[PDB]
Amino acid sequence: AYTNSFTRGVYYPDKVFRSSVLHSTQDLFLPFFSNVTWFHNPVLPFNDGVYFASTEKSNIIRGWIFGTTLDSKTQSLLIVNNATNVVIKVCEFQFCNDPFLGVNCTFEYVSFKNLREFVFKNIDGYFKIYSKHTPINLVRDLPQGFSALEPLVDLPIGINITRFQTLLAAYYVGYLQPRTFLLKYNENGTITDAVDCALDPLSET
Amino acid sequence: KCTLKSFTVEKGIYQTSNFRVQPTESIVRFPNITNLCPFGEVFNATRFASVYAWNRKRISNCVADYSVLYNSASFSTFKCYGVSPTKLNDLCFTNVYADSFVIRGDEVRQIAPGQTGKIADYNYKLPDDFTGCVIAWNSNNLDSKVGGNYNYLFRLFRKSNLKPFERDISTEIYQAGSTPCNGVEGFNCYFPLQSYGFQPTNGVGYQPYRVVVLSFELLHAPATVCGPKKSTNLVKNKCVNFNFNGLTGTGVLTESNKKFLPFQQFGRDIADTTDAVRDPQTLEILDITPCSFGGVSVITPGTNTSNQVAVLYQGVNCTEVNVFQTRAGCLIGAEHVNNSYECDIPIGAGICASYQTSQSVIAYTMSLGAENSVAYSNNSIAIPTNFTISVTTEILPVSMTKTSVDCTMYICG
Amino acid sequence: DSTECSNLLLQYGSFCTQLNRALTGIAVEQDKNTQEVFAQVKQIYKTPPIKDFGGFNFSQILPDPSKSKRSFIEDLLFNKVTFNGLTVLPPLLTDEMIAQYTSALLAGTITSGWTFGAGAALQIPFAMQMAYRFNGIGVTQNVLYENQKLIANQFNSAIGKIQDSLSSTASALGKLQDVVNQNAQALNTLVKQLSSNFGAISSVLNDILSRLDKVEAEVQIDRLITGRLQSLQTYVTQQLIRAAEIRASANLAATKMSECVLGQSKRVDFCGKGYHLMSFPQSAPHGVVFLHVTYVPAQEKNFTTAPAICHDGKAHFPREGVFVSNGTHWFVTQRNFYEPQIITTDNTFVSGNCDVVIGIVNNTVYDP
Amino acid sequence: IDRLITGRLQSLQTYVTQQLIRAAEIRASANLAATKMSECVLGQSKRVDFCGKGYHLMSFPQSAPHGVVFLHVTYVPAQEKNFTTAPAICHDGKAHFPR
Amino acid sequence: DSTECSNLLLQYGSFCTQLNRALTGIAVEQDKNTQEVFAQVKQIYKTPPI
Numbered sequence A: 001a002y003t004n005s006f007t008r009g010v011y012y013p014d015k016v017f018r019s020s021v022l023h024s025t026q027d028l029f030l031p032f033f034s035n036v037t038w039f040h041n042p043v044l045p046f047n048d049g050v051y052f053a054s055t056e057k058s059n060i061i062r063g064w065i066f067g068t069t070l071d072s073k074t075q076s077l078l079i080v081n082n083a084t085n086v087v088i089k090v091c092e093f094q095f096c097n098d099p100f101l102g103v104n105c106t107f108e109y110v111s112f113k114n115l116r117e118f119v120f121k122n123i124d125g126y127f128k129i130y131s132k133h134t135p136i137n138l139v140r141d142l143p144q145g146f147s148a149l150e151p152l153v154d155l156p157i158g159i160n161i162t163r164f165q166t167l168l169a170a171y172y173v174g175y176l177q178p179r180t181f182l183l184k185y186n187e188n189g190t191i192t193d194a195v196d197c198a199l200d201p202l203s204e205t
Numbered sequence B: 001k002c003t004l005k006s007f008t009v010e011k012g013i014y015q016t017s018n019f020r021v022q023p024t025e026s027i028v029r030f031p032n033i034t035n036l037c038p039f040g041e042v043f044n045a046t047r048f049a050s051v052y053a054w055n056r057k058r059i060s061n062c063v064a065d066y067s068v069l070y071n072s073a074s075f076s077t078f079k080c081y082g083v084s085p086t087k088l089n090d091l092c093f094t095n096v097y098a099d100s101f102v103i104r105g106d107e108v109r110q111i112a113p114g115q116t117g118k119i120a121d122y123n124y125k126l127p128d129d130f131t132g133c134v135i136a137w138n139s140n141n142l143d144s145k146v147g148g149n150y151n152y153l154f155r156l157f158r159k160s161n162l163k164p165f166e167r168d169i170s171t172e173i174y175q176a177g178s179t180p181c182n183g184v185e186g187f188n189c190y191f192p193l194q195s196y197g198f199q200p201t202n203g204v205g206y207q208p209y210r211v212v213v214l215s216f217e218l219l220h221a222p223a224t225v226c227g228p229k230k231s232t233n234l235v236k237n238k239c240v241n242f243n244f245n246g247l248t249g250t251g252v253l254t255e256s257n258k259k260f261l262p263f264q265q266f267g268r269d270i271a272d273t274t275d276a277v278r279d280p281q282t283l284e285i286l287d288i289t290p291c292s293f294g295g296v297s298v299i300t301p302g303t304n305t306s307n308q309v310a311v312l313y314q315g316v317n318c319t320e321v322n323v324f325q326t327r328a329g330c331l332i333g334a335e336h337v338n339n340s341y342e343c344d345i346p347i348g349a350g351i352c353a354s355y356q357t358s359q360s361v362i363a364y365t366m367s368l369g370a371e372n373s374v375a376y377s378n379n380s381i382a383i384p385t386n387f388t389i390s391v392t393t394e395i396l397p398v399s400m401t402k403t404s405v406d407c408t409m410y411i412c413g
Numbered sequence C: 001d002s003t004e005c006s007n008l009l010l011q012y013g014s015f016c017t018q019l020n021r022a023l024t025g026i027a028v029e030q031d032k033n034t035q036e037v038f039a040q041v042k043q044i045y046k047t048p049p050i051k052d053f054g055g056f057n058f059s060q061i062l063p064d065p066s067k068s069k070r071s072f073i074e075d076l077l078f079n080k081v082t083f084n085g086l087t088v089l090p091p092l093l094t095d096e097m098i099a100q101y102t103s104a105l106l107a108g109t110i111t112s113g114w115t116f117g118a119g120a121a122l123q124i125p126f127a128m129q130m131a132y133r134f135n136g137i138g139v140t141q142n143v144l145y146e147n148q149k150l151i152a153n154q155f156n157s158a159i160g161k162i163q164d165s166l167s168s169t170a171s172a173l174g175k176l177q178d179v180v181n182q183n184a185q186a187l188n189t190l191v192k193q194l195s196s197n198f199g200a201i202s203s204v205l206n207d208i209l210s211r212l213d214k215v216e217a218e219v220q221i222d223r224l225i226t227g228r229l230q231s232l233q234t235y236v237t238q239q240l241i242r243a244a245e246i247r248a249s250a251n252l253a254a255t256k257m258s259e260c261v262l263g264q265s266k267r268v269d270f271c272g273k274g275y276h277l278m279s280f281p282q283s284a285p286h287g288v289v290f291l292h293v294t295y296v297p298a299q300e301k302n303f304t305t306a307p308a309i310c311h312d313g314k315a316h317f318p319r320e321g322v323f324v325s326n327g328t329h330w331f332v333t334q335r336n337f338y339e340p341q342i343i344t345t346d347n348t349f350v351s352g353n354c355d356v357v358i359g360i361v362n363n364t365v366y367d368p
Numbered sequence D: 001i002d003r004l005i006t007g008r009l010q011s012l013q014t015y016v017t018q019q020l021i022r023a024a025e026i027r028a029s030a031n032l033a034a035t036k037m038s039e040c041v042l043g044q045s046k047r048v049d050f051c052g053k054g055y056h057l058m059s060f061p062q063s064a065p066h067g068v069v070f071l072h073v074t075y076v077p078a079q080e081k082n083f084t085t086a087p088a089i090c091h092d093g094k095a096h097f098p099r
Numbered sequence E: 001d002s003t004e005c006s007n008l009l010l011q012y013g014s015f016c017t018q019l020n021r022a023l024t025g026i027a028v029e030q031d032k033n034t035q036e037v038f039a040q041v042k043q044i045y046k047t048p049p050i
């Protein structure tokens, strides 16, 4: 199944305050009105980076795995919500080939009603995670609107990543691509709107 | 005179220089010094390794004061290779490997890049291009025991010499004879592991010494280990040279109303110039103002008439530099006058200056002309009863001097 | 303030001195441009305490002492138009001095006509000044004195529409706003060019010096020096070309000050469309606004006409005016306003006889 | 030598550019001086302040190095008296206006 | 149309935008210059048949 992404998947590109101003940036972004895969947990490509979101009232998603194999042969990233903490581990895990969660290593770290949104990207040896939470009033698609994702963590991991999988009532996957965006910063220095400059001739204008 | 390349100066206002306030001091700020590397075990542990079985810590995602390794008198020798011991606190690395063992005091000189000897051949080998440092100290107080501490051992022979960082703890029988040993002693077949038996009364070459070797690398994976960061006190309202988290600049720091979001660190202006910062320890937001600067202009009557001058510091507040503030800048050596005259030398923002009555440079608000109520009413007219023929002179430029340049003669010739 | 860069910049010699000499010549010219428009008045004329101007209502355009003492329309104009070693210098004349000049130009114009430009301001009643400005366009002055309340109401109503227009479009003030926008875009471009590499390792000058050995850093800095010096030469050349365009516009504004405000221009479409009566200056940010007052003819009728009339074999021509007929009777009118006069020997003059002229008509000429 | 060529060629391009911009300024002044020759030496201008202050009578050219000088002769009124005035006068119930 | 040269020309920043902006201002001025001269008439007047 597939759905339209609308104007979603924007994140703060840098840790800089700007206010009551428009700023133009090139980065990996989810293109506006792009086409995104919908699921009601297969291994998927990661490409340049992933936008991931779930529409929820029951907290069924519990983590992710990222790497090349996600299994024993070579190093990989495991991310799990342990309910008291987010936990991140970077290891050649002996963990399951068809994994589920319910009732050596080089790095480690410890921390429908809702749309929970995340961006994962891996550039110059750093792994970036961005996120947002919002209440929602729609089930059938990602709800039309705007909300910029703030950076959660920014990790010195250095690994080659090419594929990923979910650990776990429905979720969406979209792919980042190199794009130029024009971002609107309000007086509080929050991103409040954006233009995808490659979408259409008015957006180029 | 030196600006104009002349000994005679005509009446005017001349920009001769630029004024610029200098930074009063330098400031440096980084986050609270935290997350010490696990060396708190490495130099204090009760247990330690036999040299045939050397113990490695892997050091990552941390900082430490690497100067303590030679600033502290606790260590009997310190050595460094590729790196310099005084430089260590400025450096960063992807990993560091901290390799540790006990040896007798005569063996200590073998612990260097690419060496040969009973340790380097059979117990612990360093590569020829090693980058890092060695800590070594007498441990007769830690590793010796009455009747001998037999828990410490070395390998006396090996079938092949160790490769760099090879770690052979195996009970392999060494072969010197033409017959294979098959895992048991025999004709020139020897069990090669030997105990030191360290005693408190040993001579210094037979006393135990502890060693730690700190082995450095920077990879395709980013740095995770660094030396410590300094942090000065913070000074507001003075012009200073500054560094926040490696963002360098110079200017005046002032308290500000700007509410950055919790992840934001810097503020930027419309033209991408940094206009504010978060302090990395006490998380206030400071505005940055440029360190004060402007042109310097000398206001002079002609040197045919006086050698007195006034000086204008353009756009400068007189606090930063008779002395008189004008909206054009701080004006020095000119007398402020309450009269107004035609503009002689133009200063700016309605102010002019002249040389006048013991005579000095004066500065005044310019006069636009004499004030006049025209005697208007609905039935009054004025008519001229007489005239004057006037002859005005108008001068207009019409041509330049005609120039030619042979560009090949000018450039080359 | 990099000392390593400062020593390299000395190799280029006079370039940095002549950029400042060029921008200084541009800066001095902006004060001359302003002086030549507004400082055309010898004395600061002021308007009488009571406004007995024949029903013409100068109040939107004269100073308001409740406010800089700008007029009401000058306050609309000032509301509508809206550090890397770079500095902005104040003008010589303040916005309050520019408004004292437009106040004096306007007060002299209202109380004395054209006379304050040619000598001393000679007072004249405003309805008598307008009667002369009607004669200046070839309309007889009795046309003003017979229509004075209508003419004053049309003027007062037309000034009222200037408040409405200035409160409800940007399309006219776009000329002054574009001069503000071009100078702001030029300085933004000059500042953004500090972030460029020009093929150097970095755009940040301390980040070159702190990460390279002396001879290598020197080669990287010389690329920043070359590109930043070319970035200044491009800005200063573009400001020189733009200053020549502003000087042409300031010389035109100084000419409309003399010929439209201090005079009554006979030049077609120089002081607005229609036959020019007078105009008033108002100050604006970086500019001047002229309120050009013109007579426009408005309700024409067709008539039959003849070049001459034939009387006692004599051909008669009008001294001023044109012969016209309503179909049955012949009259002479002034040319720009229908006012038929009976044809007489003092409305007209003779030349030769009726056989010569193409299209002459037979008529009586009354001899008083 | 290529560093000298680069800098001397940029130095000479700067000179020619500023002489082109200065020649345009001198041409505007020569076009004005040619217009004052026609409208004030060959004529009598009715344009206010085009040829001196006061009402223009005539003007005379004198040559100067790289330029022209106009001696502009003007009538300036000098010694005014105040009078009462009226727009028109009655006579036989008709209004009269000054011709 | 070389991609290798284009990524070197990006290192010179605003120079190539302001050259195109200068020539576009000159181009729009030529149509203004033409309408200042010829468009001085409000209605397209015609001469009679005779």
Ligand SMILES: *[C@@H]1O[C@H](CO)[C@@H](O[C@@H]2O[C@H](CO)[C@@H](O)[C@H](O)[C@H]2NC(C)=O)[C@H](O)[C@H]1NC(C)=O
Pocket (backbone or CB within 6 Å): C326, C327, C328, C329
């Ligand atoms: C042309 O104008 C004359 C103006 O004198 C008109 O003739 C007058 O008409 C009025 C009545 O409309 C009479 O009271 C006058 O006695 C007439 N004067 C004369 C001299 O006869 C004439 O009617 C107009 N013709 C047209 C076709 O409009």
Ligand SMILES: *[C@@H]1O[C@H](CO)[C@@H](O)[C@H](O)[C@H]1NC(C)=O
Pocket (backbone or CB within 6 Å): A002, A035
């Ligand atoms: C989304 O992807 C599917 C892939 O089969 C395609 O059929 C569909 O047309 C796409 N929709 C849009 C809007 O591109």
Ligand SMILES: *[C@@H]1O[C@H](CO)[C@@H](O)[C@H](O)[C@H]1NC(C)=O
Pocket (backbone or CB within 6 Å): A186, A187, A188, B259
């Ligand atoms: C800007 O920030 C202040 C302080 O948090 C807040 O009161 C205000 O409502 C914010 N304004 C907007 C437009 O978000």
Ligand SMILES: *[C@@H]1O[C@H](CO)[C@@H](O)[C@H](O)[C@H]1NC(C)=O
Pocket (backbone or CB within 6 Å): B032, B280, B281, B282, B283
């Ligand atoms: C750093 O230390 C000071 C003094 O102990 C403390 O006030 C401050 O809260 C610490 N920094 C942070 C980021 O909490």
Ligand SMILES: *[C@@H]1O[C@H](CO)[C@@H](O)[C@H](O)[C@H]1NC(C)=O
Pocket (backbone or CB within 6 Å): B317, B318, B319, B325
């Ligand atoms: C700066 O100048 C203003 C007047 O322009 C003056 O009031 C102020 O006291 C000066 N600044 C300081 C720090 O004194």
Ligand SMILES: *[C@@H]1O[C@H](CO)[C@@H](O)[C@H](O)[C@H]1NC(C)=O
Pocket (backbone or CB within 6 Å): B338
């Ligand atoms: C000059 O003006 C100031 C402020 O109005 C006043 O205090 C001072 O007494 C005046 N001095 C003279 C000599 O007029």
Ligand SMILES: *[C@@H]1O[C@H](CO)[C@@H](O)[C@H](O)[C@H]1NC(C)=O
Pocket (backbone or CB within 6 Å): B375, B382, D080, D081, D082
């Ligand atoms: C009379 O004329 C003179 C000269 O123009 C003028 O100064 C004076 O003000 C006039 N008289 C009155 C009563 O205003």
Ligand SMILES: *[C@@H]1O[C@H](CO)[C@@H](O)[C@H](O)[C@H]1NC(C)=O
Pocket (backbone or CB within 6 Å): B385, B386, B387, B388, D079
């Ligand atoms: C007019 O002025 C001249 C001096 O310019 C004087 O000699 C002459 O007497 C004056 N005539 C009258 C009528 O005032």
Ligand SMILES: *[C@@H]1O[C@H](CO)[C@@H](O)[C@H](O)[C@H]1NC(C)=O
Pocket (backbone or CB within 6 Å): C051, C057, C059, C060
């Ligand atoms: C002139 O116009 C103003 C409004 O512009 C009005 O208030 C005033 O009554 C009018 N008449 C006079 C004589 O001022």
Ligand SMILES: *[C@@H]1O[C@H](CO)[C@@H](O)[C@H](O)[C@H]1NC(C)=O
Pocket (backbone or CB within 6 Å): C300, C301, C302
């Ligand atoms: C009469 O005058 C009007 C107004 O100028 C004009 O439009 C009309 O063409 C004229 N009559 C004829 C028959 O042409």
Ligand SMILES: *[C@@H]1O[C@H](CO)[C@@H](O)[C@H](O)[C@H]1NC(C)=O
Pocket (backbone or CB within 6 Å): C358, C359, C360
């Ligand atoms: C005017 O034109 C008509 C034809 O339209 C002609 O008969 C007549 O002779 C002409 N008259 C003059 C004065 O040219």
Ligand SMILES: *[C@@H]1O[C@H](CO)[C@@H](O)[C@H](O)[C@H]1NC(C)=O
Pocket (backbone or CB within 6 Å): C310, C362
């Ligand atoms: C005009 O009058 C003369 C003398 O009465 C006569 O000869 C001539 O034919 C007349 N012309 C016209 C056009 O009626």
